[PDB]
Structure 1
Amino acid sequence: SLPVVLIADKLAPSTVAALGDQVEVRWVDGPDRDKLLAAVPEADALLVRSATTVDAEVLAAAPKLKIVARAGVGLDNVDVDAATARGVLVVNAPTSNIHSAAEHALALLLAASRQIPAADASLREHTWKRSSFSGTEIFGKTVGVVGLGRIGQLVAQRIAAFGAYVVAYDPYVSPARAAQLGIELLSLDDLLARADFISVHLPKTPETAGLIDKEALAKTKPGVIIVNAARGGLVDEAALADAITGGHVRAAGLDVFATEPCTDSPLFELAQVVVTPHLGASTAEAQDRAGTDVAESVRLALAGEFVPDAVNVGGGVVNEEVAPWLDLVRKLGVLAGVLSDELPVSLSVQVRGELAAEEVEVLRLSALRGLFSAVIEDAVTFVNAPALAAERGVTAEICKASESPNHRSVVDVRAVGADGSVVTVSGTLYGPQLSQKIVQINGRHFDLRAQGINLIIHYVDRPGALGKIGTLLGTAGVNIQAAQLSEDAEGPGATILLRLDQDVPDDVRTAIAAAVDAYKLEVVDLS
């Protein structure tokens, strides 16, 4: 009885030939609700593009569905939470667009510097305005790449062959990796000051959104050309428009918009801004790569093999004992990352106690996901460890030990720096509700809900510090839910961690720092 693979969107059989001849591939008109729901019941696997929505209703009608695969990168049309809830593996094609998108960034950089669309338009109108145009040479210039993941790396490499020096800003790439790339790593401020061209290559996360605002646009070089083929509103659209008009930035290329279906941006009224309707992945080659990627993923899935492009957990892929540990470990990675001065080169995940008897490799991935979540998009729970190591320079390992000093089971996430220093953070689950607890930071022990907004402060001025800190937070109207603080074992330092009921305004952060004389002041959302 051959397993059924249902194609609900427009993928050709040839695109999908990586599925064996060990399967029965069928096709359905996915946009058409009644058809989809009629066909999905017998589906083992469901492939989809973007036209079809794989929501709860579809999932509830698909009782033996094992994989939902999206031939693409977005997961907008798939309720991944619901698929996880029902044990359904979700997969996408995460590197399927990187070339077509790099090339489009380059296309836009060049179109903008050489004013192509307007020139082409002038000839379209049957006149010769050669005299009016004036391009910008790339050779010898400095190009700032903001965000150095796969695409920014491809863009850096292409642009370098034009004889441009390349700099980057990306706190989630290690220095050794950037130097292997022959790219100089800079503060965003320093990139801004130096770049003749800027190409943005960030994912959208709240850490990223609107990164380049009026204040950033004002620090750039006069005459700069800016490209955004990445995401939504990474460059504030109105600030851009202002600086274009005002003269300061010479030109720009945009492929993505703060709010898409976008037909009314004021930027569309500026000639010196080249714009395109989210092309980037719009390419036979990229759409084919998506299809053939996802097809292999479905193959491995059905063959009971490991699916590296998994986006989630589903099936036996995780014991019931281990499952609730994923989320907690994610939070240990986030925290280990936040308490680290700079990006660690590796995470050592240590599993101690009863848990050590379990199969816990997925936890090493959870730790990584957490560490990198400032550059990971929400839906994705899994990361491709081998890919992340090669792209960004960071690894993970897992060690077991029968003994746990105190709790029956504990996980420690050791974040190690290139210089050999270590930041250690531990957690447990315990009790009927298996609530998640943070239990150690750097040799200090306590018991705090792994949840909510947490303020962490390392500081040097001790007497009355509790008073100062609490009083400033309280004057700001900030409730303190829980807290842990201790004086450092060796030296003049102290450390407090507080769980708060809202975020902490910038002026109040500055006040607290000044008042207790902090060297480290951080606020991480541990949801």
Structure 2
Amino acid sequence: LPVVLIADKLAPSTVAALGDQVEVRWVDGPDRDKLLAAVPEADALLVRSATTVDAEVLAAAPKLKIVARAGVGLDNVDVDAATARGVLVVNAPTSNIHSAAEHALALLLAASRQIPAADASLREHTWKRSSFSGTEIFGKTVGVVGLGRIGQLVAQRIAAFGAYVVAYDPYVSPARAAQLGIELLSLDDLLARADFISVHLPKTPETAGLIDKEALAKTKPGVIIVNAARGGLVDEAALADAITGGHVRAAGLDVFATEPCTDSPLFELAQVVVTPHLGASTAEAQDRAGTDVAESVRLALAGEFVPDAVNVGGGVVNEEVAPWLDLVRKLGVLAGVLSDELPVSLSVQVRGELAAEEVEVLRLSALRGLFSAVIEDAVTFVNAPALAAERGVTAEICKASESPNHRSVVDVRAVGADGSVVTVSGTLYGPQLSQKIVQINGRHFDLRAQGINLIIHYVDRPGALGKIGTLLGTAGVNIQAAQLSEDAEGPGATILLRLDQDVPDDVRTAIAAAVDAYKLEVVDLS
């Protein structure tokens, strides 16, 4: 009878979802000696955040099948390690959404009404009612930056206050927004137009420090801004500058560029409400984490599908199909990048020898690629059913016996809402099974799918390759591989380069001007 080791503060009621087919025991997880002694006969490991599920732990745990995190975060878990030992990692990704949206709302009201200061004022014994002045919400515009689950929640709640909602999110399809009854804007237009901004981005180099000194300066004077989402999404220093200057009326942070956080100058400003990362401190949110994580462990031990799965592990993937996960992920990205807007759907097409395999994971990989920009690292799998409902993009697979050129090739067709298609293809071959991008939109070639790749679609005149190469040489950037050809027909040609580092902004720009680029992108294929 399977053993489930619970190594963090999780109530047995909280995990009654593990039927009576399992023997459930507890251990004091943050006690290394005890934990290590306990894990050896665990089929399953539930943890919260106090326990660190380490390289050492997993090696101590040779019978392990599922390490489950009752929570959203993964920082206390070394997934890559679990992946390499065949151990399925899972979490509770949607267990905190309600508590966190509610907190965003709390912070928003608390800040517009100077609550803790008022409350503090009666705590000192003074009637300073005349000094306060709050901001009314009815009829105001609210800008939601990032329209994932929590942002869509906050959007429903705030809307019922009679606010207008607008959002910025290049990773929600326009139709999906419109269904939510939300107007999609460039982050420029939101900034200008919102009276309230609540931010709801994951943390990704794409994202960190979005709302900088330069962004705050486009915001409506009188803005109230709220970040209950991540780390340093809104620049603490530039915020302090704007509060003080009065340009922004108030703020509410739940999260800090670096926590534990004790010494910010934000704690000296009054008009800024702050709380020590409370968004998910709710008995309801912790129980949900547990009950969810229980259910996943159940599915996982019945050998059923595990949609909350973070990675791959156990025979859930053939050795022959395994190496294609990463590459298809890469096509996904690329197809994302080469698209004008966000595709309404991915059509993963698998041809040649590979078509004999179970290749349904590869559809998950493509999506995981396409959405790299709003997905945090450790996550490798994601919920397709959930993704569709939330953002409104889907994916499907099609197998085909014949592969025209290579023995096996995977083609990713990003389809645009308007009927247009971008296609990107890769294969693997050779004793090393290296990843090669072998087609982009009718253009065949062979490039290692690795490193920093620059892609340009410019005007085909003599010496454009010159201009591009020579500009790069001046930036002191080496080219590892390059490829160009035709455009279907017309003006325009298409180049792709592996470089040894990023192209800095002014340089990136100079190139667009020198070949008169239509489009110019830079993508990290690692």
Q: TM-score range by the shorter chain?
A: over 0.9
Equivalents in 2 of 1:479, 1:23: separation in Å?
58
Q: Deviations over 1:128-180 (max 9, x none)?
A: 00000000000000000000000000000000000000000000000000000
Equivalents in 2 of 1:460, 1:423: separation in Å?
20
Q: Deviations over 1:35-79 (max 9, x none)?
A: 100110000000000000000100000010000000000000010
Equivalents in 2 of 1:374, 1:421: separation in Å?
22
Equivalents in 2 of 1:475, 1:23: separation in Å?
65
Q: Deviations over 1:216-236 (max 9, x none)?
A: 000000000000000000000
Q: Is the 8 A contact 1:203 1:377 kept in 2?
A: yes
Q: Is the 8 A contact 1:173 1:343 kept in 2?
A: yes
Equivalents in 2 of 1:189, 1:399: separation in Å?
40
Equivalents in 1 of 2:241, 2:200: separation in Å?
22
Equivalents in 2 of 1:451, 1:267: separation in Å?
42
- SS in structure 2 opposite 1:20? coil
- SS in structure 2 opposite 1:518? coil
Q: Deviations over 1:395-442 (max 9, x none)?
A: 000000000000000000000000000000000000000010000000
Q: Deviations over 1:436-482 (max 9, x none)?
A: 00000000011000000001011124221000000001101010110
Q: Is the 8 A contact 1:100 1:280 kept in 2?
A: yes
Q: Deviations over 1:258-289 (max 9, x none)?
A: 00000000000000000000000000000000
- SS in structure 2 opposite 1:457? strand
Q: Deviations over 1:476-506 (max 9, x none)?
A: 1010110001121311111101111100111
- SS in structure 2 opposite 1:154? helix
Equivalents in 2 of 1:457, 1:186: separation in Å?
26
Equivalents in 1 of 2:486, 2:286: separation in Å?
57
Q: Deviations over 1:354-409 (max 9, x none)?
A: 00000000000000000001000000000000000000000000000000000000
The Cα shift of 1:191 comes to 0.3
Q: Deviations over 1:310-334 (max 9, x none)?
A: 0000000000000000000000000
**Does 2:158 align with 1:159?**
yes
Equivalents in 1 of 2:130, 2:487: separation in Å?
70
The Cα shift of 1:509 comes to 1.1
**Does 2:423 align with 1:387?**
no
Equivalents in 2 of 1:458, 1:283: separation in Å?
51
Q: Is the 8 A contact 1:345 1:394 kept in 2?
A: yes
Equivalents in 1 of 2:340, 2:475: separation in Å?
28
Across the aligned residues of Structure 1 and Structure 2, the Cα RMSD in angstroms comes to 0.4
The Cα shift of 1:340 comes to 0.2
Q: Deviations over 1:221-253 (max 9, x none)?
A: 000000000000000000000000011000000
- SS in structure 2 opposite 1:155? helix
Q: Deviations over 1:492-527 (max 9, x none)?
A: 111101111100111111110011111110000001
Q: Deviations over 1:7-29 (max 9, x none)?
A: 00000000000000010000000
Unpaired segments ≥5 residues, structure 1: none
Equivalents in 1 of 2:53, 2:461: separation in Å?
55
Equivalents in 1 of 2:522, 2:236: separation in Å?
28
Q: Is the 8 A contact 1:56 1:82 kept in 2?
A: yes
Equivalents in 2 of 1:448, 1:460: separation in Å?
22
Equivalents in 2 of 1:212, 1:458: separation in Å?
30
**Does 2:374 align with 1:378?**
no
Q: Is the 8 A contact 1:436 1:449 kept in 2?
A: yes
Equivalents in 2 of 1:496, 1:514: separation in Å?
15
Percent of paired sites with the same residue: 100
Q: Is the 8 A contact 1:200 1:229 kept in 2?
A: yes
Equivalents in 1 of 2:460, 2:63: separation in Å?
62
Q: Is the 8 A contact 1:448 1:482 kept in 2?
A: yes
May I ask how many residue pairs the two structures share in their alignment?
A: 526
Q: Is the 8 A contact 1:267 1:273 kept in 2?
A: yes
Unpaired segments ≥5 residues, structure 2: none
- SS in structure 2 opposite 1:250? strand
- SS in structure 2 opposite 1:253? strand
Q: Is the 8 A contact 1:461 1:517 kept in 2?
A: no
Q: TM-score scaled to structure 2, two decimals?
A: 1.00
Equivalents in 1 of 2:509, 2:309: separation in Å?
42
- Greater Cα offset, 492-501 or 357-366: 492-501
- Greater Cα offset, 482-491 or 340-349: 482-491
Equivalent position of 1:488 in the other structure:
487
- SS in structure 1 opposite 2:518? strand
Equivalents in 2 of 1:246, 1:438: separation in Å?
51
Equivalents in 2 of 1:310, 1:182: separation in Å?
31
Q: Deviations over 1:189-229 (max 9, x none)?
A: 00000000000000000000000000000000000000000
**Does 2:221 align with 1:212?**
no
Equivalents in 2 of 1:415, 1:184: separation in Å?
24
- SS in structure 2 opposite 1:467? helix
The Cα shift of 1:341 comes to 0.4
Q: TM-score scaled to structure 1, two decimals?
A: 1.00
